[PDB]
Amino acid sequence: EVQLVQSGPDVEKPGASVKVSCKASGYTFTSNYIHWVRQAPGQGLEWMGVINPRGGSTASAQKFQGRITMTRDTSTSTVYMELSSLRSDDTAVYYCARGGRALFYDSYTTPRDGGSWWFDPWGQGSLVTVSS
Amino acid sequence: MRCIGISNRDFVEGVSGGSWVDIVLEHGSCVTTMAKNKPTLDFELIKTEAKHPATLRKYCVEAKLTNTTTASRCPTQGEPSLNEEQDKRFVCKHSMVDRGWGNGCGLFGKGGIVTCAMFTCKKNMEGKVVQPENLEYTIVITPHSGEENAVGNDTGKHGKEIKVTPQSSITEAELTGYGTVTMECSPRTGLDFNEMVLLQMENKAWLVHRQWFLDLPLPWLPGADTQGSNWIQKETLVTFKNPHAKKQDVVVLGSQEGAMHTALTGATEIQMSSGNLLFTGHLKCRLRMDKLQLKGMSYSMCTGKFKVVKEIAETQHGTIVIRVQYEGDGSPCKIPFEIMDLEKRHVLGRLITVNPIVTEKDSPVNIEAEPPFGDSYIIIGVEPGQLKLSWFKKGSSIGQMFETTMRGAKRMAILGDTAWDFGSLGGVFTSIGKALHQVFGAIYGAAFSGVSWTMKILIGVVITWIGMNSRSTSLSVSLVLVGVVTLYLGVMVQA
Amino acid sequence: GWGNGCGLFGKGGIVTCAMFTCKKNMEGKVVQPENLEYTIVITPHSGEEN
Amino acid sequence: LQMENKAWLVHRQWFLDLPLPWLPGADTQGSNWIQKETLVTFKNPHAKKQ
Amino acid sequence: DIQLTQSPSSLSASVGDRVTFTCQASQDIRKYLNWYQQKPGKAPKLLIYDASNLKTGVPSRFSGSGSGTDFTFTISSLQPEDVATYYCQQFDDLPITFGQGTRLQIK
Amino acid sequence: SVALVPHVGMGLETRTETWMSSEGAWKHAQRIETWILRHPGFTIMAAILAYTIGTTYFQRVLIFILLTAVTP
Amino acid sequence: SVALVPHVGMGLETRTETWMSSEGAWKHAQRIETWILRHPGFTIMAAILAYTIGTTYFQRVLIFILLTAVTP
Numbered sequence A: 001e002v003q004l005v006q007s008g009p010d011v012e013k014p015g016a017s018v019k020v021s022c023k024a025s026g027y028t029f030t031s032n033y034i035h036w037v038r039q040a041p042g043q044g045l046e047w048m049g050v051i052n053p054r055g056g057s058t059a060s061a062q063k064f065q066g067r068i069t070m071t072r073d074t075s076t077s078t079v080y081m082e083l084s085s086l087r088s089d090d091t092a093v094y095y096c097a098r099g100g101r102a103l104f105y106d107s108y109t110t111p112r113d114g115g116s117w118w119f120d121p122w123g124q125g126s127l128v129t130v131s132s
Numbered sequence B: 001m002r003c004i005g006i007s008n009r010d011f012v013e014g015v016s017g018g019s020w021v022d023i024v025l026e027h028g029s030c031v032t033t034m035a036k037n038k039p040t041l042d043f044e045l046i047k048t049e050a051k052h053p054a055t056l057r058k059y060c061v062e063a064k065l066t067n068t069t070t071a072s073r074c075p076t077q078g079e080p081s082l083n084e085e086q087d088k089r090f091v092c093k094h095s096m097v098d099r100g101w102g103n104g105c106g107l108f109g110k111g112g113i114v115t116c117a118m119f120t121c122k123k124n125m126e127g128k129v130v131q132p133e134n135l136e137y138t139i140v141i142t143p144h145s146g147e148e149n150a151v152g153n154d155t156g157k158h159g160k161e162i163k164v165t166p167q168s169s170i171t172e173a174e175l176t177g178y179g180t181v182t183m184e185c186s187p188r189t190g191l192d193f194n195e196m197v198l199l200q201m202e203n204k205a206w207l208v209h210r211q212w213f214l215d216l217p218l219p220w221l222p223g224a225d226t227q228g229s230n231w232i233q234k235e236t237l238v239t240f241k242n243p244h245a246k247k248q249d250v251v252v253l254g255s256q257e258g259a260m261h262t263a264l265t266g267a268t269e270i271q272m273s274s275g276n277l278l279f280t281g282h283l284k285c286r287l288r289m290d291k292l293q294l295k296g297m298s299y300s301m302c303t304g305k306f307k308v309v310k311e312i313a314e315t316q317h318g319t320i321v322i323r324v325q326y327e328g329d330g331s332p333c334k335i336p337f338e339i340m341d342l343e344k345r346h347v348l349g350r351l352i353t354v355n356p357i358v359t360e361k362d363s364p365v366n367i368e369a370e371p372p373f374g375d376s377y378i379i380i381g382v383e384p385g386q387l388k389l390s391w392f393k394k395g396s397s398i399g400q401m402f403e404t405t406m407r408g409a410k411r412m413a414i415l416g417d418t419a420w421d422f423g424s425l426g427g428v429f430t431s432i433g434k435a436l437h438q439v440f441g442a443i444y445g446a447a448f449s450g451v452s453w454t455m456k457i458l459i460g461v462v463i464t465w466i467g468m469n470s471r472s473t474s475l476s477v478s479l480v481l482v483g484v485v486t487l488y489l490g491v492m493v494q495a
Numbered sequence C: 001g002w003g004n005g006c007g008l009f010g011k012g013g014i015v016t017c018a019m020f021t022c023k024k025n026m027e028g029k030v031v032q033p034e035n036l037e038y039t040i041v042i043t044p045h046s047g048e049e050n
Numbered sequence D: 001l002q003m004e005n006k007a008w009l010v011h012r013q014w015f016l017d018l019p020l021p022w023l024p025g026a027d028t029q030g031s032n033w034i035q036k037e038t039l040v041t042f043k044n045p046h047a048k049k050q
Numbered sequence E: 001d002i003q004l005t006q007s008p009s010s011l012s013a014s015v016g017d018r019v020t021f022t023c024q025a026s027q028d029i030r031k032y033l034n035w036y037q038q039k040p041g042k043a044p045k046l047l048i049y050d051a052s053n054l055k056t057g058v059p060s061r062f063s064g065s066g067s068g069t070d071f072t073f074t075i076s077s078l079q080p081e082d083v084a085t086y087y088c089q090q091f092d093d094l095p096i097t098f099g100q101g102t103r104l105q106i107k
Numbered sequence F, G: 001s002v003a004l005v006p007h008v009g010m011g012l013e014t015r016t017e018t019w020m021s022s023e024g025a026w027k028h029a030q031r032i033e034t035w036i037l038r039h040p041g042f043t044i045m046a047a048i049l050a051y052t053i054g055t056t057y058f059q060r061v062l063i064f065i066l067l068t069a070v071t072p
């Protein structure tokens, strides 16, 4: 089925870098866009960035400019988010999910739209805490 | 009304065609039009708003360095290497110095050496582009005829805002009473975007055509960005010292921001704060007036006894607005406004209120008109003749036609052959004009484009000279055309 | 004009002024052909090691 | 000529004629700068303001 | 840039009631807007797309409305299992952004 | 650098003034003439060249104003 | 501004390299040639002028490389 399994929660020291994984199933792993959305406990949802499984194109939000890399393994049908220079503010839960995708490379607006952003089957979330 | 005082304005007489008219209007300009009927309207052009941009380019005007390891092999053998040369976020260079027993190592020769540096930029340029889509013009089309305050104060509601976008057309507009009006834009005939770039600096922005904005030096970086820090270039930035022999050094280049200003001169700027402010440019609309009442019909002519407030107010060539305040009963009755010669009615003015009208009574209604080149005898009064005001217009016939020709010259310049369209319905020879100058000046004005004041005027005088000494009557095709296009276009441009 | 509100309709004179205060400078100085000196090492050949 | 921490040796005249805001060696408080015409430029869009 | 405002911040209501939310956009977003429900400790969930549209599998009491800058989400009859925090989502331009959220409290 | 490309002839202009607005031209002139005042000899030699080559009087004039233009 | 009069010929030049050393020249060239590529027509007309005026061949060459030197 449409499904997402993220890796389990982790904790890191400030200034560090963390790598969270997003595995998917139930469709063609190259047929949907991936986005990462974060939620701080005392806050709502925040859109971190985007990766396209097909071909590897990527994009990110201004706030995380410089701080976040996205990669994939097609063979495993899995996406990797990574954040650098971890700081206490970064402590939150992270989420990943999809889009119904025209084709090559990632980001569209005009072609209708995805009609979500980590709400349908983005996964189960995972907790990460930046602490000393 | 909302035109007056802006100078530089566009009187368009008559329509014919059964309907329409061709108006070319921009920003600092505005347009006043007339027909043998229908109320005089004014087209004033305000902010142009392009909504959705998309970001192509990152230029940085300033950076800094740190870390910055370096190496040399010392030998002959080898060209030195360093691991951080791998990440292109560094900058790298090879140079050659020398080494030996002083350096301590091998062989006594002129050595290879390298260096790298981490590279990070604080300041940018946001330059984006907009497709010839959702971008829109906003127009105020204002009626004349009284209703106090200001021939001025473009603020305040009369001519609406009449929005338009290429996405739509036909520009259906309404005003009180007569105010049914149909306009048609041709924005795709506008600035020719996709040739265009909107460039936001720290605040101020500039509209410059694409290629130049591609070829411009200084550190490159593509719209995708996204942590990339991937900057190409940097060789024109961050120069490296190599004093006489030993070692070498790397130097932050220093902000060019001003110099960049010096570059962006010769370009109209643009303010951009929220989403767009865009000014300048120009557009072409065609106007179908069918659909217009005279704003009042079958009345009585005033009664009598007007009492004026203030005086004459010429402004550029003509219009002579006057303000008057009617006193009496008769309710919104026509105002018998006339402009006459000395005595012995020859009467000739030309009146632009056309069909002035009293409102609710008390309210300072106003008028504008065009007396002849000479003495003028203006009369609003009827039953006890009520009033007469002496006027004199200086200037003005030959000089008029002359200055007019100057205007039409400027408009042949600046705006091009859209200028030829700026009249209306000349049948054949207007069209054939627009085409002849179309491809003609298309070849000639450009191709010998990209040139400035100096070289323009100078090339002008030289080619007109070689024309003066040419044979076979072709001198004219040299010569008159030459000197004209060259000189006249020489001083008028680059403003 | 009447839009501006005031007098009879012409092209007006206008002025402006601004405070002016500077960021980074250049200190440029000069030195007289005095107060200036050269330092030389005049080294012998012939061994030691060094 | 000392900039923020690099300097340059250049011959006098050119360093006199160089544009950009002038100011004499005395200054301290003077803030007296004589130029500025080549520095801050003034907009005058189509008609009103500046 | 595009600032999505969500109102009100919270509501308490009795079962069966009709409830509405409003989201206001700093720019015209046309028909791109979204409505989330999220229960605590759960991933967010879908409700409304294109501001007008239910998803299949979503109960019918849900609806959405509004066009240029302004929008309203509506539940016809409050139901207890609907206790959650709700959101609206601007997709336009892609500096992807969310509404701050609205919490419910059952009466 | 950006010191020279200063987006001038180009096109697109408009009805409204742009930037340095009736300056940068007279700037251009004033500065090159200044530099002429500073280095008169080069003017001399150049002019001599004008009297040497071609010289077809109008020619002289031309190549002379050239050798004025030649200073960066 | 300082954009031009870049303290070059001047004098005083030392044994040691100065600043942009071995760049700003090939900068200057690359710059202007680029601008030539962008505006070929002006090259054309100018060359024509060279074939018009003077034109004892060497002359043509000279006044042409003015075209090169016309203006960035």
Ligand SMILES: *[C@@H]1O[C@H](CO)[C@@H](O[C@@H]2O[C@H](CO)[C@@H](O)[C@H](O)[C@H]2NC(C)=O)[C@H](O)[C@H]1NC(C)=O
Pocket (backbone or CB within 6 Å): B149, B150, B152, B153, B155, B156, B157, C002, C003, C004, C005
């Ligand atoms: C330009 O238009 C505005 C809007 O009508 C004028 O302001 C009005 O002035 C009258 C004069 O008594 C007031 O009664 C209105 O209340 C004003 N409108 C407002 C405040 O919105 C303005 O006077 C006009 N310009 C000039 C020069 O008169």
Ligand SMILES: *[C@@H]1O[C@H](CO)[C@@H](O)[C@H](O)[C@H]1NC(C)=O
Pocket (backbone or CB within 6 Å): B066, B067, B118
């Ligand atoms: C640069 O040097 C700083 C110390 O000032 C160090 O913390 C940093 O890791 C270095 N970065 C690189 C890329 O060498």
